[PDB]
């Protein structure tokens, strides 16, 4: 009744391929596939340069004028799956696959509401866990 319901869809993975990453796709599928990712990344680049001009503005102003679904993580971001126009042909031996299925299927896991988004993150301690010497080595005299 509660175990028998399907999970929530956090940010959408699609199982279907674009059919542009396709071992000599149709060239329009190729073109639109590069174009969408170009839009997506140039947006990130423009906000990057916004941070850059922000930072240099503040660095000027420091000197110029005067003085006297939880865990803080969404699904991990998808990476590029593209072959450029030079590295594609017939003679399938040429084919270099691209895209890490670990990252991608883990995105599917976190996307389809099965698991929470997380680091594997390594060790950590709060306090010193003090060292000192045993009675026996202390008093062997």
């Amino acid at each position: 009744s509660t175990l028998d319901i399907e999970p929530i869809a956090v940010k959408e993975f699609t199982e279907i391929p674009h059919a542009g990453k396709s071992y000599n796709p149709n060239n329009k599928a190729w073109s639109e596939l590069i174009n969408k990712e170009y839009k997506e990344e140039k947006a990130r680049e423009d906000e990057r340069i916004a941070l850059e001009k922000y930072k240099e503005r503040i660095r000027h102003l420091m000197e110029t004028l005067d003085d006297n679904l939880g865990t803080k993580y969404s699904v991990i971001d998808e990476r590029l799956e593209i072959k450029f126009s030079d590295e594609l042909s017939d003679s399938l031996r040429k084919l270099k696959p691209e895209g890490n299925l670990l990252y991608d299927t883990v995105r599917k896991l976190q996307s389809s509401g099965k698991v929470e988004t997380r680091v594997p993150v390594r060790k950590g301690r709060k306090y010193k866990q003090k060292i000192t010497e045993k009675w026996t080595h202390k008093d062997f005299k």
Binding site: T2, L69, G70, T71, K114
Partner: protein, 87 residues
């Protein structure tokens, strides 16, 4: 009729966190996760998290406590504790 101690029903009586669920089960995160996926139940989002978690919009998970009631009587858990004793 003994005024009813606000935060104890509805959201705060079906939605329970990881931390409280392993206070219940006493066992581990990792056996709690192995059990989760093996007996698969998945985390949820409630409609009002502040009123669920007593004022607090701290980002965390909730697990449909009825499912934990299911997880208690489960044969695999005995076997995991037997793995511990064996080790």
């Amino acid at each position: 009729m003994r005024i009813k101690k606000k935060n104890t029903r509805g959201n705060a009586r079906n939605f329970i966190t990881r931390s409280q669920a392993v206070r219940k089960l006493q066992v581990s995160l990792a056996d709690f996760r192995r059990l989760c996926i093996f007996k698969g139940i998945y985390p949820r989002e409630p409609r009002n998290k502040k009123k669920a978690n007593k004022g607090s919009t701290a980002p965390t998970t909730f697990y449909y406590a009825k499912d934990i009631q299911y997880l208690m009587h489960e044969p695999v858990l005995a076997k995991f504790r037997e793995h511990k004793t064996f080790a």
